[PDB]
Amino acid sequence: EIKELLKLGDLPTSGQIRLYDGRTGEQFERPVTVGYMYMLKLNHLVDDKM
Amino acid sequence: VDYSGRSVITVGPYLRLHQCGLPKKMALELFKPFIYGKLELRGLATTIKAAKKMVEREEAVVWDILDEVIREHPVLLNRAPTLHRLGIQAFEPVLIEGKAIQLHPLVCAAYNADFDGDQMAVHVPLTLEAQLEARALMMSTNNILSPANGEPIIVPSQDVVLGLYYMTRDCVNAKGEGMVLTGPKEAERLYRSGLAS
Amino acid sequence: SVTEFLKPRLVDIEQVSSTHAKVTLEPLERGFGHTLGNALRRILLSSMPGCAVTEVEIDGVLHEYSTKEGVQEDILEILLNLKGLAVRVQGKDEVILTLNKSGIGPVTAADITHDGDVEIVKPQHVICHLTDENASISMRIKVQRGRGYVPASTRLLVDACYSPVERIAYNVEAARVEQRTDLDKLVIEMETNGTIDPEEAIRRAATILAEQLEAFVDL
Amino acid sequence: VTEFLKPRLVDIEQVSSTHAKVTLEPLERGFGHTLGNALRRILLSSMPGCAVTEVEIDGVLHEYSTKEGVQEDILEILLNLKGLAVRVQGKDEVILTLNKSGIGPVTAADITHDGDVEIVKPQHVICHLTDENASISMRIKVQRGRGYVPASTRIHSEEDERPIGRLLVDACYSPVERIAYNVEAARVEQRTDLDKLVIEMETNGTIDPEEAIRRAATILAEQLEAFVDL
Amino acid sequence: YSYTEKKRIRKDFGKRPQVLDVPYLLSIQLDSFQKFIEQDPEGQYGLE
Amino acid sequence: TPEEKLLRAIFGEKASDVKDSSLRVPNGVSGTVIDVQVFTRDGVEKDKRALEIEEMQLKQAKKDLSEELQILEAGLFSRIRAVLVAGGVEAEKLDKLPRDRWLELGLTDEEKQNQLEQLAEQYDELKHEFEKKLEAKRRKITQGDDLAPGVLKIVKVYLAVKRRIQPGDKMAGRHGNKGVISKINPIEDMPYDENGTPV
Amino acid sequence: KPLVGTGMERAVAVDSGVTAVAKRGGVVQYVDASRIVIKVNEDEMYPGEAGIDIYNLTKYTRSNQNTCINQMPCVSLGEPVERGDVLADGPSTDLGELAL
Amino acid sequence: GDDEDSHLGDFIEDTTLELPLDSATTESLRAATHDVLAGLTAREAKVLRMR
Amino acid sequence: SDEADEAYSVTEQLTMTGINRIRQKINAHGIPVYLCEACGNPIPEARRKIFPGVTLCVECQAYQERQRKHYA
Amino acid sequence: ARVTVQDAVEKIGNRFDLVLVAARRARQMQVGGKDPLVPEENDKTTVIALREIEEGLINNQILDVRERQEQQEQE
């Protein structure tokens, strides 16, 4: 089903893209996984640590 | 113990392995008497009270005087479970405009550190005998061998062994195969150019 | 205002060997280290006018591979020793040289038929060594004036390293103005065969890149 | 041998109000990627925007409050202002008044426009009035800069610093959001090694593509002047 | 469909048909206390 | 001390009978004071700010209680009106005379009339109830606070710091992948897909 | 919101306290950043003592951990509501989902 | 009942000690006053000290 | 490292040296015995076919394991 | 800024005396009125003393001899 939904949009079925480098602009070989992950922010904030 | 702080270590791969990042806030606070003496030695502040006022206002010359003080004064870094004698090392502080003690990557093997929240504690050595102990007996460039056995404790861990591995390998038919090169400089001149895998 | 970018206040250009420079540009505004260094090394590495040996026809080998009584070197190592030969042609172009010779010793760069404008930058360069005989080694080498580095696979050819620059490599390190947290500090570090100095090499590369933007700059 | 046909600006194509892909056709084989990445990084990094920086609603003290009539807390009004794409021409700072009353959404079109100012998307929502007699009286302050100056870094302006009503907002002066580029085969009349560089770009409206990559080229050319001198 | 769920309805995978809806998640706390404090005419539990 | 005495004589100052122990923001914090309450012992007399905040609290308690009683009034009035639409026909011959003259207006003595009586009683109960609630609330606002023995008054401030993500914070997926942010690099420097958007 | 969730978000957020879920069906008579007023239906109405449900929302106040707990109205004026709906998202909720 | 099991008698600061900054000030004050007196006639300086 | 990264290795050693003793109780050798070393009953062909090298009939093995189960 | 003391521990022998000698030498240039022997390049007195120790122009016997000679110029 995840392949099916990645195919609904025109994304690549294998879940991996080819990113290009932002500093040299040359494509990273070996295509990378890029997706949308849900990042929390645990409140071990540094400025109560330092 | 006084002249001491703790905070969260981060990676900072840009470093050498004899320095450690150190936030301007931490640095300016652990090193107060040093800055006070230096501001009243350079004449940037009349008294010591004037120097305290200047620092607590954090003027543009306070930072430069800080970076003058910091220069060769190595600070000790220590972690919580000091399992062995490499749990305490000493680095030279590279002032870091931030709030996390950027600790060089290769040293996490020794410290048993990792960057998911492990706090490290920085100590300042005051006297001159202390700075010479730290720079001569405890510097992070002086203990590259595990004291358990002469094998080094500086072995690259995970991003770097995988990068090095991916580099020194070989496909069976890649770009630019077979050609012969005048040396390693020509190797990089091809690779960065884009003519050889 | 909102158009005043930091221009660098150079703090080092330390020629380590007069063919190996190292240039510390700074302080560049943040992220300018990577744009500048990467543009200059792309140019210095793949677009640089220069001459260089392209194809040498030796009389005694119809292949890229053979034996040649008199030289202990292989033939592919003769192509190697020619790739390192750094020639500079004056206003003319597409010269051919000849290196017929024989004897006992090495075969330096000065042992060519020394033509007018074609200049050997290091005559001491070693091509091949002959044995103790009257052993014949006669070759007709053919150079041209080209731009990047074209391998022989795109075409007795030779991978034509036309460009002067042998190795560019920058680094971006965190410089600083009085309070600003992070800025750039380009550490370019170049090597060349000698046909153009590192300093002059960077100068010509940046001049190329700046000429390209003529249609777009404004005052 | 050493010619290097310089590029020039072939057809600009405004796909939409913001999405506009320029073309620089006659690029030597190799200068395509160099120019493309250099230009893209200059556009995303360093470009002049005229974002909102200081806001002063009528009867609010902080942004952690609420005002009877608006269905958003003031923090949401500020977050809805911060994305207000505006284009000033004459000055480098201007005080746009927003006076509105009555039920209904409150949108940037309802800001009292002056000749200097161009609110590029007037349908962009700032608030939601929801009382029969309640009004918002704010005095936004647009000003122009580069990149991202956050509010905290900006509150050391020493004297007259600063009345309890004035709420600073993070200024985000950079009109370009996406910049992608492609190097394709530039079929000049008789050549075979030629590529043209096409640059998409997705502004907020306050920036024209030829003007954009004219300023970008200006920046990079002057830094290259510093290099070439040595 | 609930009005708050036609606002953004979540595409639901998962094949098993739900037999017992989720309980009231805070039920232990509220239940046990209001069983502790309640006019309950018998010695079941609570104050009396 | 000694010479401190000379330095005092020289510049004619007086060492103050008081020293200061004033509440200053802990170092590092930076925020907006968003609320301040002043608890005062019962024996003491309130300063200017405590009485200012009592003014604010009483006016706000009145405004809240009256806004709420007005909303409930409006609901009750509209329900009674919707009863005076059928059986008591004044379609819009009812929308101009006094609305408070609807608890005593015309209808049959039907179940509609029993409802109208019940609703009028609801109106009077709303009035009486919100009045007594306002009286209790005002007495609660202006009534002595109890305090630890020895404390005169207490002043509480509520800063609203606004944290922004910065290197050294912990983040996490939901799958037990913690990690300390180590650098917040610019946008240009981030990997970007072929279409132009960076990760 | 989670672009990838397990559907338990809705229930966990409603059955928690922070959401201001409706107490009876009806129409949103006057919404505001601090209070939601609900003209209840007549069918879900009590016979005498008509009334209308007026919720006041907790604005910026500090939890025990010094985080800010503050509700926000997710309804709009004139919008219907049914019993058990969500009127205001507390802290870390998006339309009656748990957005952490 | 904390982690270290430290008691109450270890959270009592000593409000009589002088901060090392303050002692290092008045040492500097002794320096400054001696300096100022040095640039005075011996009569006025001895009278200032003795006074 | 972390909690989970060492917990993995603790669990992994647990599982491995739990598999190995249960697998070492298995007989892998070959010496047919034909007579249960406690009761002399003839171990049938099949029960010697499964575990080659088994030196007890099934009855006596059940007895001995029942005895083992209380650590006697 | 000096990174290793390999050649310093080499020249002076013991490594616990590379500390002590360097510390007393630096103390002479921080407390006392001495002038560093080697060209200081924005260097700290600690690293300067180590640098002198490393070239082989300052060590235990030399410092003792200079203190003796100085007290002999005390006359």
Ligand SMILES: [Mg+2]
């Ligand atoms: Mg850890």
Ligand SMILES: [Zn+2]
């Ligand atoms: Zn048996």
